[PDB]
């Protein structure tokens, strides 16, 4: 079949600054006969439904802000937006009309900007949960930036991957920022076998690694 | 324009059937043509297959093969998809998409089909609180975790919604056929451990509403 | 094609007078003759009278003699209906209907006359709860009354509109001439009592609004 | 005068089928030379004004659809519908404009099918009652079918028969079912003079009264 590729897959881009998006597809889309070039351009709001914005490539369609503007022949396609608003945080999507099936992009989230610093806070297990028959140990990361990070866990000096599991929401309108939750799981008898509990994140901003700590007794 | 007018969420199980009816309005229905889209672990759009209701010509992709049919009625001008031998990747939205001309494409509100072998129960509330006495920073955190409940989404409150300020709710993780969701909030040093808060969650489907204190 | 137009209710007392006014538009009202009809207990109706317009032609029932007098305005083009010696049996929804031809007629939407020896009073509400500590059912059923207001009507919600489903609404009935109401609503026992509900009543002539948590 | 009569007072019907309604003068309403006969039927929906249906008996209303008609001269009045609506819920009347005083018709009503029954709506007084010197027992009926039903009280095994408020609502837009609300008022120092409190009902369709009761200590 025919592939398409869509690079970057994401963009951080302020107030006021232009955008411009790649969909690459795996040969010429264009068409001899009506000289029209066939692809669409969709943008999925969070929590809504994705909608047609710029159709053949070359119009925009009735209703379309004039801030979209479609333009790229042949192999290359390039999307511009003149200005971006406060309303244009979404998902694109690149679609394909020339061939059966129809291909669908991989898409492209927008982000906001900028410079979050993080923060750990660790929480010891409760008291219904050693009496239900296990425990958790888990540490949460709020307030940072990019969404790019890692999380370790290491268990009495030892590192163990086994009931790792992450937790990651959207972007907080309210400080432009994420938040993360990490969650380990473990049963009440390796929680008496064992002591200290640590885990350990990365962040591209920090030199070290912000390491926290609590004990059993 | 058109009013496209879906079914609700459906919760079936692995094995079975499952029907999804899309109701177009304002325009002839044998005229335009129908599709339909899958959207894939949230930020991936899949294509289903399309119909011509004039001709009822019926074609697929590759991966959808011997899967989902494609009927539709004339009377009504509606369009069924039916589903068989359902696994569990088959949980995703669907869309209705209905092509009328090439400027825009007119597109549904979208179906949410949850397919697990899961029993409804009530959930459970484990509260969090720091083990520290003592801390530099000026603003504490605390945690609320809601385990063992089923099914998705549960409204989680803090102090019956009186504090809207520095609330993070995580979204569920599946667990062996259990959803599990965290959520934390940020309070300064000045009520804690001054005042006492609790953690209030709601669960629809189960009515069973259950509050604990930190 | 016409327009019917009337006063609203009004709050009379014992012993006065009451003018009822019938609006018309669209039509010469030196023409077709107006009639009145008297509607008791909800459903059956009752022949008031007519009269007309350019001839002073009036004819009354055997039973508004002495009581209903018709009184027509040609500058003005409207109706006119005045009563003398009000009592308890003479609050009824009131309608005018214009006489056209023998086939169809025109229709009002009605004025709403009460008449009573009254005093408005904030409406005094109380809690109620079953008293058994166990039961068979599954639902939990729970109600308020209302009781000492006046004048109609009353909104009577639950949770602040919250919960639209199970709720019923029954009428008031007069007793020591005022009104009193009740409603009830299902609630499941996996809430009850371990959350609380409120009754919010609502009084717009008093502008009282007061809440019980049960 | 002359005075008409309508039978039956109610029927239950359903989805589909037909309806006739009867109205029956005591006196001849035709008129020799026109062969026409004086009536009219009237259609009046809950909060909105009454409307006409068939006039002269013989004929439709312009803008009325074609399922209303009606046959019939002289002493007995036919009104017929081929196929009821959801919309079709209203209370019918008929009048002759014979003769003066003009006379008017019962009123039918139709109503929906079928088998709704409740079982204990028993509230015991509150604590608040007994604050302003009175005091009220209620009982209530939800989900029932048909509309007509007997209430009694019983105190200490005695009937009472004042102090009685009954109450009853229309027919539900869901369930299509009824809702009977009991009031039984009283005095502040006869409450505390009975203890056992007994509501009975009789309904239709079980061939034995339900009966429930409570104790004040």
């Known amino acids: 079949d025919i592939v398409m590729s869509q690079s970057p897959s994401s963009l951080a881009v302020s107030d006021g600054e232009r955008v411009t998006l790649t969909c690459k597809s795996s040969?010429?889309?264009?068409?001899?006969?009506?000289?029209?070039?066939?692809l669409a351009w969709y943008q999925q709001k969070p929590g809504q439904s994705p909608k047609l914005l710029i159709y053949?490539?070359?119009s925009r369609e009735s209703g379309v802000p004039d801030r979209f503007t479609g333009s790229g022949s042949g192999t290359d396609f390039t999307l511009t937006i003149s200005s971006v608003k406060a309303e244009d945080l979404a998902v694109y999507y690149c679609?394909?009309?020339?061939?059966?099936?129809?291909?669908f992009g991989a898409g492209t989230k927008l982000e906001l900007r900028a410079d979050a610093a993080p923060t750990v806070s660790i929480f010891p297990p409760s008291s219904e949960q050693l009496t239900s028959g296990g425990a958790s140990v888990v540490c949460f990361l709020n307030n940072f930036y990019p969404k790019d990070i890692n999380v370790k866990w290491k268990i009495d000096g030892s590192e163990r991957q086994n009931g790792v599991l992450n937790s990651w929401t959207d972007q907080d309108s309210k400080d432009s920022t994420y938040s993360m939750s990490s969650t380990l799981t473990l049963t009440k008898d390796e929680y008496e076998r064992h002591n200290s509990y640590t885990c350990e994140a990365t962040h591209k901003t920090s030199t070290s690694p912000i390491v926290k700590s609590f004990n059993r007794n | 324009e058109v009013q496209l007018q879906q079914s609700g969420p459906e919760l079936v199980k692995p094995g079975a059937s499952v029907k999804i009816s899309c109701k177009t309005s304002?325009?002839?229905?044998?005229?335009?043509?129908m599709y339909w889209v899958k959207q894939s672990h949230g930020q991936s759009l899949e294509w289903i297959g399309g119909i011509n209701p004039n001709i009822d010509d019926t074609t697929y992709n590759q991966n959808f093969k011997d899967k989902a049919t494609l009927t539709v009625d004339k009377s009504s001008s509606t369009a069924y998809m039916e589903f068989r031998s359902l696994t569990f990747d088959d949980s995703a939205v669907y869309y209705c998409?209905?092509?009328?001309?090439?400027?825009?494409?007119?597109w549904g509100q979208g179906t949410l089909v949850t397919v697990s072998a899961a029993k409804t129960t009530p959930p459970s509330v484990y509260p969090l609180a720091p083990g520290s006495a003592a801390q530099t920073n000026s603003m504490v955190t605390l945690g609320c975790l809601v385990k063992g409940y089923f099914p998705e989404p549960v409204t989680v409150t803090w102090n019956s919604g009186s504090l809207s300020s520095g609330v993070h709710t995580f979204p569920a993780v599946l667990q062996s056929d259990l959803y599990t969701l965290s959520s934390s909030v940020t309070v300064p040093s000045s009520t804690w451990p001054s005042e006492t808060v609790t953690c209030n969650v709601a669960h629809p489907a189960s009515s069973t509403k259950v509050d604990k204190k930190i | 094609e016409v327009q019917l137009q009337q006063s609203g209710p009004e709050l009379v007392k014992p012993g006065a007078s009451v003018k009822i006014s019938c609006?018309?538009?669209?039509?010469?009202?030196?023409?077709?003759?107006?009639?009145?009809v008297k509607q008791s207990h909800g459903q059956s109706l009752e022949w008031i009278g007519g009269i007309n317009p350019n001839i002073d032609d009036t004819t009354y029932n055997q039973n508004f003699k002495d009581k209903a007098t018709l009184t027509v305005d040609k500058s003005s083009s409207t109706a006119y209906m005045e009563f003398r010696s009000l009592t308890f049996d003479d609050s009824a929804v009131?309608?005018?209907?214009?006489?056209?031809?023998?086939?169809?007629?025109?229709?009002?939407?009605g004025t709403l006359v009460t008449v009573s020896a009254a005093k408005t009073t904030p409406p005094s509400v109380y809690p109620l709860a079953p008293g058994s500590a166990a039961q068979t059912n599954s639902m939990v059923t729970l109600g308020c009354l209302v009781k000492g207001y006046f004048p109609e009507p009353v909104t009577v919600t639950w949770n602040s509109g919250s919960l639209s489903s199970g709720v019923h609404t029954f009428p008031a009935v007069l007793q020591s001439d005022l009104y009193t109401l009740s409603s009830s609503v299902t609630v499941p026992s996996s809430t009850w009592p371990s959350e609380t509900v409120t009754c919010n009543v609502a009084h717009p002539a008093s502008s009282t609004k007061v809440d019980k948590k049960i | 005068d002359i005075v008409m009569s309508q039978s039956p007072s109610s029927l239950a019907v359903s989805d589909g089928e037909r309806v006739t309604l009867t109205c029956?003068?005591?006196?001849?309403?035709?008129?020799?030379?026109?062969?026409?006969?004086?009536?009219?039927?009237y259609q009046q929906k809950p909060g909105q004004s009454p409307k006409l249906?068939?006039?002269?008996?013989?004929?439709?209303?312009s803008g009325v659809p074609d399922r209303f008609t009606g046959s019939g001269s002289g002493t007995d009045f036919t009104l017929t519908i081929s196929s009821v609506k959801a919309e079709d819920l209203a209370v019918?009347?008929?009048?002759?404009?014979?003769?003066?005083?003009?006379?008017?018709?019962?009123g039918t009503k139709l109503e929906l099918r079928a088998d709704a029954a409740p079982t204990v709506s028993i509230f015991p007084p509150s604590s608040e009652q007994l604050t302003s010197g009175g005091a009220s027992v209620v009982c209530f009926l939800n989900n029932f079918y048909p509309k007509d039903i007997n209430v009694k009280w019983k105190i200490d095994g005695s009937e009472r028969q004042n102090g009685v408020l009954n109450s009853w609502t229309d027919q539900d837009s869901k369930d299509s079912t009824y809702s009977m609300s009991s009031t039984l008022t009283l005095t502040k120092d006869e409450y505390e003079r009975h203890n056992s409190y007994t509501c009975e009902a009789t309904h239709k369709t079980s061939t034995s009264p339900i009966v429930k009761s409570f104790n004040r200590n």
């Open positions: 998409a209905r092509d009328d001309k090439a400027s825009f494409a007119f």
């Open positions: 053949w490539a070359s």
């Open positions: 679609q394909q009309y020339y061939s059966y099936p129809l291909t």
């Open positions: 040969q010429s889309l264009l068409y001899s006969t009506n000289q029209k070039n066939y």
């Open positions: 304002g325009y002839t229905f044998t005229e335009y043509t």
